[PDB]
């Protein structure tokens, strides 16, 4: 084999398989070639910034990754040296992990990846009935299903979750079963082991808590059993708890609003408590408001520690956590300033109050129409409003600087006053003759007319046009993002759960086959789905 670091471990068997030469592979195996020889040079690793090709480093995984079924079969069941189907590479990946790794969700790639995955499972059952390949974890602790979910390989995931195998001695490998079928109607069963709940890498958790860079994280929940399962969890368990949370938050904001509205107006806090009913209610509301601020503060800390976003994932995703945390930050700063005998606490408090009400839109998830609407609002802010505000502020500042330069020794004669006065045109209140303290009136009026045409006439209508272009394109994306938002809500509710309730585990424990490779019977927590079809009687 090669001994240089770049091609380290490559041997003649790797080249023979790479060349698709069955004869040379047979010859090399006959002559004592090592079928477990790992090609662990740098070239055969992921290493996105360098050329290479990762395939799991092993000849069996090399054949499987290159759509060479004949070589796979030969390597597994040759006489001279059978290959270890359960072998693991330097990363801990088996052949199935490698098949997941090479997936890229294109039709032709997915086709052979799913087929080769299926064939390997069939052969593994036939050669090693007691072996459970799909439960093997690599060094990251990920099974092939968990790896597929985390990497966004939606095609592989969609294959696995509804895999149905119609033959003896491989029925127990299925995850989709048909319990009864009467006329056109039949009731199928989806397995749900390691989807709903498991040790670490539940598929729902892996998708929901993905790092925002996974390619298909919004689309993965469209795979049938997952969408139905989340709807079931919602309706049965989470709808009520979410509504209760929303109600409590509304009460919180009402108390905060009332406590703030009736603040005393004398200088220099803190204010002596007067021995009257209104003041006991006011101070009670203040204590509850500060309490809620502390609560959201600690929830924000818990989120940060439990996720550990890496300072870019911290901001490009999870806006709602940031907004609730910032609200609580304003509340705490308000408390500090209040007891520091500074009136500026009011400045803090109102910001929190404003944020407190706008964060009410968080709860528009849990309603499909409003949730999708709120997602569209989010995307408008992030795309169109940000672009528009950059361009608009460039124009506004440029013409404000020109006009304030033209004005001399006037009332306005300042960047703030002139910027405000020109901004008034945008909101339909522009004076258009707000000062005469200049020379060259023609220049002044020309500048104002150019500003009006460029911003009021051109840019705002252009903003409307671009928002129209955007909504036309983000319908399906918005629905998918809302579904993901509700999925995260469901998982967080069930991980909190506040009562040690076991009913959150849905779907019921049914017997699928009752005949594993040994005599034991298999109960596998299936989820029932009825279907009807008027063809293929």
Ligand X SMILES: CCCCCCCCCCCCC(=O)O[C@@H](COC(=O)CCC)COP(=O)(O)O[C@H]1[C@H](O)[C@@H](O)[C@@H](O)[C@@H](O)[C@@H]1O
Chain contacts with Na ion (rule: CB under 5 A)? 428
Cβ proximity to a copy of itself, 288 vs 471, nearer residue: 471
Span 119-158, contacts to a copy of itself by CB under 8 A: none
Region binding a copy of itself by CB under 8 A among candidate stretches 91-99, 150-158, 273-281, 501-509? 501-509
In this chain, which stretch among 1-9, 240-248, 334-342, 510-518 interacts with a copy of itself, using CB under 8 A?
Answer: 510-518
The sheet that has 527-532: what strands, in order across it? 176-181, 185-190, 527-532
Residue 453 interacting with ligand X (CB under 6 A)? no
Burial 368-382 (b: 16+ CB within 10 A, else e): eeebbebbbebbbee
H helix intervals, 128-192: 144-151, 154-161
- In the DSSP assignment, the letter for residue 143 is -
Q: Does 47 contact a copy of itself by CB under 8 A?
A: no
* Total chain residues near ligand 6EU (CB under 6 A): 18
Binding of ligand 6EU by 377 (CB under 6 A): yes
Among 154, 380, 412, 422, contact with a copy of itself (rule: CB under 8 A):
380
- Smaller CB distance to a copy of itself: residue 141 or 184? 184
Interface residues for ligand 6EU in 353-372 (CB under 6 A)? Answer: 354-355, 358-359, 361-362
**452 vs 393: CA distance, rounded Å:** 14
> For 47, which DSSP code?
-
DSSP 263: -
Q: What are phi and psi of 472, to 5 degrees?
A: -65, -25
How far is residue 214's CA from residue 2's CA, in Å, rounded to a whole number?
Answer: 35
Least separation in angstroms between residue 522's CB and ligand 6EU is 42
223 forms part of the interface with ligand 6EU (CB under 6 A): no
Site string for ligand 6EU, 426-455 (x = CB under 6 A): ------------------------x--xx-
Closest CA to 91 of 34, 141, 133: 141
Kindly state whether residue 481 participates in binding ligand X, applying the rule CB under 6 A. yes
Using the rule CB under 6 A, which residue among 230, 259, 374, 422 binds ligand 6EU? Answer: 374
Near ligand 6EU by CB under 6 A, which window of 199-207, 373-381, 461-469, 522-530? 373-381
The 3-state secondary structure of 98-136, one letter per residue: HHHHHCCCCHHHHHHHHHHHHHHHHHHHHHCCCCCHHHC
CA 392 to each of CA 339, 384, 401, 405, 508: distance values in angstroms, whole numbers, following the listed order: 41, 12, 14, 20, 58
Q: Select the span of 248-256, 284-292, 330-338, 348-356 touching ligand X (CB under 6 A).
A: 348-356
Annotated binding site for resiniferatoxin: 319-320, 358, 365
Site string for ligand 6EU, 291-320 (x = CB under 6 A): -----------------------------x
Q: Are 149 and 217 in contact (CB under 8 A)?
A: no
* Of 376, 484, 490, 504, the one binding ligand X by CB under 6 A: 484
In b/e form, how buried is each residue of 321-354, taking b as 16+ CB within 10 angstroms?
Answer: bebbbbbbbbbbbbbebbeeeeeebeebbebbbe
Q: Which residues of 273-312 are buried (b: 16+ CB within 10 A; e: fewer)?
A: eeeeeeeeebeebbeebbebbeebbeebeebeeeeebeee
Binding mask 183-212 for ligand X (x = CB under 6 A): -----------------------------x
Give whichever of 224 and 378 is closer to ligand 6EU, judged by the CB atom: 378
Which of 300, 312, 429 lies closest to 355, judged by CA?
300
C-alpha distance from residue 380 to each of 10, 165, 399, 469, 478 (Å): 52, 46, 27, 11, 11
Question: Quick one: which of 149, 158, 206, 323 contacts ligand X (CB under 6 A)?
Answer: 323
Residue 382 interacting partner from a copy of itself, ligand 6EU, ligand X, none (CB closer than 5 to 8 Å by kind): ligand X
Dump the DSSP string for 513-532.
Answer: -S--SSS---B---EEEEEE
Which residue positions form the known binding site?
A: 7-10, 18-19, 319-320, 358, 365, 428, 431
Per-residue contact flags (x/-) with ligand X for residues 328 to 347, judged by CB under 6 A: --------------------
Cβ of 447: how many Cβ atoms within 10 Å?
A: 18
Comparing C-alpha atoms, which of 33, 87, 29 is closest to residue 58?
A: 87
When asked if residue 507 is in the footprint of a copy of itself (CB under 8 A), the reply is: yes
Q: How far is the CB of 477 from ligand 6EU (least distance, A)?
A: 15
Q: Could you give the CA distance from residue 527 to residue 236 in angstroms, rounded to a whole number?
A: 14
Q: Footprint of ligand X on this chain (CB under 6 A)?
A: 212, 317-320, 323, 351, 354-355, 358-359, 361-362, 378, 381-382, 450, 481, 484-485
Residues that bind ligand 6EU (CB under 6 A): 320, 322-324, 326, 351, 354-355, 358-359, 361-362, 374, 377-378, 450, 453-454
């Amino acid at each position: 084999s090669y001994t240089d670091s770049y091609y380290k471990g490559q041997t003649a068997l790797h080249i023979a398989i790479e060349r698709r030469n069955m004869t040379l592979v047979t010859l090399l195996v006959e002559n004592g070639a090592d079928v477990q020889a790992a090609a662990n040079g740098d070239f055969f690793k992921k290493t996105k910034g360098r050329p290479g090709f990762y395939f799991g480093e092993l000849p069996l995984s090399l054949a499987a990754c290159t759509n060479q079924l004949a070589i796979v079969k030969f390597l597994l069941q040759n006489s001279w040296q059978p290959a270890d189907i359960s072998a693991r590479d330097s990363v801990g990946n088996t052949v199935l992990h490698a098949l997941v790794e090479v997936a890229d969700n294109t039709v032709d790639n997915t086709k052979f990846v799913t087929s080769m995955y299926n064939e390997i499972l069939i052969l593994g059952a036939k050669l090693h009935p007691t072996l459970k390949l799909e439960e093997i974890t690599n060094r990251k602790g990920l099974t092939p299903l968990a790896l597929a979910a985390s990497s966004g390989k939606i095609g592989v995931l969609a294959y696995i979750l509804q895999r149905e195998i119609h033959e003896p001695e491989c029925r127990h490998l299925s995850r989709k079963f048909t319990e009864w079928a009467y006329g056109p109607v039949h009731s199928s069963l989806y397995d749900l082991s390691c989807i709903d709940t498991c040790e670490k890498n539940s598929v729902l958790e892996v998708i929901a808590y993905s790092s925002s860079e996974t390619p298909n994280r919004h689309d993965m929940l469209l795979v049938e059993p997952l969408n139905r399962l989340l709807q079931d969890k919602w309706d049965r368990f989470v709808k009520r708890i979410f509504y209760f949370n929303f109600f409590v938050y509304c009460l919180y904001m009402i108390i905060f609003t009332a406590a703030a509205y009736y603040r005393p107006v004398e200088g220099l806090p803190p204010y002596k408590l007067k021995n009257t009913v209104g003041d006991y209610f006011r101070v009670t509301g203040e204590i509850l408001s500060v309490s809620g601020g502390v609560y959201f503060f600690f929830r924000g800390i818990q989120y940060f520690l439990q996720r550990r976003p890496s300072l870019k994932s911290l901001f490009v995703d999870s806006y709602s956590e940031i907004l609730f945390f910032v609200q609580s930050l304003f509340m705490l700063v308000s408390v500090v300033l209040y007891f520091s005998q500074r009136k500026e606490y009011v400045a803090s408090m109102v910001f929190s109050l404003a944020m407190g009400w706008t964060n009410m839109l968080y709860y528009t998830r849990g309603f499909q129409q409003m949730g999708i609407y709120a997602v569209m609002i989010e995307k408008m802010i992030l795309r169109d409003l940000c672009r528009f505000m950059f361009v608009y502020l460039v124009f506004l500042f440029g013409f404000s600087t020109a006009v304030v330069t033209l004005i001399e020794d006037g009332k306005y004669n300042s960047l703030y006053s002139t910027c405000l006065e020109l901004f008034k045109f945008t909101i339909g209140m522009g004076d258009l003759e707000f000062t005469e303290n200049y020379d060259f009136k023609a220049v002044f009026i020309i500048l104002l007319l150019a500003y009006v045409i460029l911003t009021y006439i051109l840019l705002l209508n252009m903003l409307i046009a671009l928002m129209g272009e955007t909504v036309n394109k983000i319908a399906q994306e918005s629905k998918n993002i809302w579904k993901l938002q509700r999925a995260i809500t469901i998982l967080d509710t069930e991980k909190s759960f506040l009562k040690c309730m076991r009913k959150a585990f849905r779907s019921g424990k049914l017997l699928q086959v009752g005949f594993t490779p040994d005599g034991k019977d298999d109960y596998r927590w299936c989820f029932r789905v009825d279907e009807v079809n008027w063809t293929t009687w």
